[PDB]
Symmetry: D2
Subunit: 257 residues, 4 copies
Amino acid sequence: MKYMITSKGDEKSDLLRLNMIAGFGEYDMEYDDVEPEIVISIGGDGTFLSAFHQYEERLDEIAFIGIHTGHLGFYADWRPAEADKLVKLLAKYQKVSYPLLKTTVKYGEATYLALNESTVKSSGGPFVVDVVINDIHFERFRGDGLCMSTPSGTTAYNKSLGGALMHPSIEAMQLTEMASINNRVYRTIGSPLVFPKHHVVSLQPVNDKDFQISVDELSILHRDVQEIRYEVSAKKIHFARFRSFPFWRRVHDSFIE
Amino acid sequence: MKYMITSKGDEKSDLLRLNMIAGFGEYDMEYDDVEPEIVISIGGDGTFLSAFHQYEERLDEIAFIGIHTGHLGFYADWRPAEADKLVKLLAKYQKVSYPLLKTTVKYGEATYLALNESTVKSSGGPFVVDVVINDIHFERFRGDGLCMSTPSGTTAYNKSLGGALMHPSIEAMQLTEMASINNRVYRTIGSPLVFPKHHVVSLQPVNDKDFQISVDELSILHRDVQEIRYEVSAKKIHFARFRSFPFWRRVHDSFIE
Amino acid sequence: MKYMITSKGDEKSDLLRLNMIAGFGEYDMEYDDVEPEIVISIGGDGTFLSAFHQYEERLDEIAFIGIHTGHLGFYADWRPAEADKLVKLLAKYQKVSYPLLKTTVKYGEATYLALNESTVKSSGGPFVVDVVINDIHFERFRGDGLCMSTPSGTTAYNKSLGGALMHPSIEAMQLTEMASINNRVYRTIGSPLVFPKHHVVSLQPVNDKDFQISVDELSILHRDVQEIRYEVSAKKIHFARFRSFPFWRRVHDSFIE
Amino acid sequence: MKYMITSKGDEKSDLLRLNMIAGFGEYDMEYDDVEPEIVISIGGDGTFLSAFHQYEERLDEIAFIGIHTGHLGFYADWRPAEADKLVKLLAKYQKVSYPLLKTTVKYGEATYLALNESTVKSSGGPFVVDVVINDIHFERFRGDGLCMSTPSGTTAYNKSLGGALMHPSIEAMQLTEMASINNRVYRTIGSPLVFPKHHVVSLQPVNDKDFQISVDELSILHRDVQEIRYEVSAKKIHFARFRSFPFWRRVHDSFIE
Ligand SMILES: NC[C@H]1O[C@@H](n2cnc3c(N)ncnc32)[C@H](O)[C@@H]1O
Ligand SMILES: NC[C@H]1O[C@@H](n2cnc3c(N)ncnc32)[C@H](O)[C@@H]1O
Ligand SMILES: NC[C@H]1O[C@@H](n2cnc3c(N)ncnc32)[C@H](O)[C@@H]1O
Ligand SMILES: NC[C@H]1O[C@@H](n2cnc3c(N)ncnc32)[C@H](O)[C@@H]1O
């Protein structure tokens, strides 16, 4: 098949990349970074995220696989010394799909896909937005911001905000808070919220209408924002898996020992 | 159909019960607390939980409905003044099903069903158990205890422990911690964990083998425990719904205003 | 004595201000916003903070007092209807002093005073700084930022970050975290830290050297930062108190009912 | 001086004890476990706590020192290999004092001292008590229980409950919550509270009057309880220190690396 390889750009990763290409040359694998079926990322989860966003247009045609030159990542879960074993099995593997988050921003409209999360903060503060779930006004949020995470993203930013870790087989999204003000006056739920497919969470401005919005590593200031809509994407990311590496096992290795 | 009515036992609830029965007498509704198809609970969520456990043997034949004489509950979501409207619609409604938690306790075996959660604490402390997910040892927990919650239960005990609130349409279970010790020596994940169907969480003793185990309001001391197994039950609870009362709307009314 | 009055600037507060001045005219109270002994703030805690910073140069010569035209504040603790009673007692009161936080920023030096807190975030992220206590390297922080709060400030930003509320009679400062990354790799204490007088907390850059630093409402981007030093200030703020309004009672009224 | 030595009771500690005694025999140090001036604990913090409670009657006459045969403790901060160096310096050192917590229990009265904390839970639940600070009703607590920690105790149970770590030079006490219920109905402060000297926190029963009360390792069920009073003790514990081992350095070694 057609394949491409992105690299963290450090000496370690660039040289490992040139080796897999050479090993791939010993097969009928046409390198093609235009319309690849196999996308290999060498570096960290940050490198993988970039690889994902480079090709978010052809997710249903691509099977991703990540190699970590540094510490064990959640997407880059295969060790550098397994490279030669990878180049073989990719030539002759089953696919694993994770849910994605669809974010829509309306002005006075733009959509994005996130593998980890999409967050919202204010350009200077204070940050005030009304939270609306399925058209029902749920709360008015006062604080630093909000984070909407995918299943696979719960181990990332979501985790640092006190959110729960959920298995990627669960088609859902999770909203956590950032330093929410809670008075006898102002009131937020406090707890993280987990939404199923087809549930629409909408954030609506109260005073200011400029927000610092991010999707994964991308962080854009958006002006004249009228609404921000979160919902579990219809599109899914496909991973090529050559071995059994259980999510909970990945969680254990990352956080426990 | 056959129906039965349990009451919190206070003057308010007992008299509301006698009225619905009388109103039910004006129809072809045979009162039968042996094999009822309709189980009505009048009181609070505590009354409802009892009603559920009285008939956990015939869940697939019963449609539950709760009336709250006190404050708005999550299971007892219908106001007392709607009683007469209830007795009518029940005579001629669609069913809503929530996931349940199956708990298994092995000795040197007993199973239970929970509508809210099952917890584990130690009889005198210290509490130490090994946590095993799908046969893989995940962590060794040191602290006060652990809580495994259903979707509908996340608004209860789970919530006070920092757990996330998840929609009851999601077939899953959530594990939270109780005052976990975290040293450079001892290590727990800290974050709540959300498991999908068919995932098995097993708790295994390290030193002591006696534990205070609860399922909902039931709290039993269990001796010579070898293992405690948690997994999303195959059985589901069925609610009779005569109106639209969205879960998130119930959450808003309960915690926000 | 000499006195001055600042106002939130809304119709309510401006008119209450003109009334107290007039009532003050019936006494020997020279209005002087250059070298006042009595500084009265009418509005909210935000108005009070501004009043404090307008005169942070003569704290030992000023006795502050706040009136809240909106909701009960912690510094603006006196109701609008008590204005006439205030103008009287100020003419003929005991002083209450709260500890302040001294922040020092060195380049390749500037000091500030805070009544609530001083925070540090990164200009674009990621935020990485080494935390050094009394010259001993304590940890390397990875996350969104850090907050150092005064005793009276613990009810503010500090509170939303999970920090503890401490009585203002305690000469100390408290450091809380903002979404700290905690891996098997990266490690922070997680818990808030409370330092006594004469303890010096120093934040030192690791990669980037530009930080968004705030003291109370003031938020300045600082470039080429070498060090940020936190320590309990030698200066204290003085309040004029005409009645008994216990801190814990203020906390109760603000957060409980 | 007179001295005594308690041991964890394991082979390691018992043999280290017999060695220090022998080394002490080479000096004019009369072993006396009745009225010792020097109390040495060999084991862990648990052993030290026991040593403290064995002699809580003569705290102002005793200087404690702890040796850890296992992992680094906060009270047992001296390594086993430093034993011979200890026996020398104790013969010819300065004292360090930490604040203690005084707990009073009234019936229809008994006092205790705690080095770490005193907690309150219910015998079967539910746990409901009114919290009263300096005679002012602050809140009505609904949940699992409450914990009142000393400065040195904040690194213990207090820490697992989300409490802040405070320096032992600060004469104060800190109250944290255990799984508190927070509805639109029931309301607790949520945040930990830090009280200075002379502040009295009183817990008063609402329905049940039986509570599981602990002070450090001691856990007693108390019946017919009318009130539980917490306040910073007038008594302090005295440590013999032969080197400089900063509290924050102890915290770093224990939790960071
Ligand atoms: N490389 C981009 C990734 O960095 C993660 N991130 C950003 N801020 C974070 C934070 N404060 N804690 C944990 N993860 C964080 C966040 O998950 C984002 O997708
Ligand atoms: N009536 C029994 C119900 O009481 C709930 N519960 C017990 N302890 C709790 C607690 N500490 N916080 C919130 N909910 C709690 C818990 O959800 C259980 O199912
Ligand atoms: N008027 C300025 C004051 O606003 C407070 N503040 C800022 N962000 C906050 C936040 N996210 N939560 C609670 N308080 C906050 C913070 O205490 C600052 O001193
Ligand atoms: N040896 C007795 C000591 O054990 C500590 N402790 C009890 N439960 C704990 C817990 N759940 N987490 C951390 N520390 C705990 C608590 O500090 C007590 O003083």
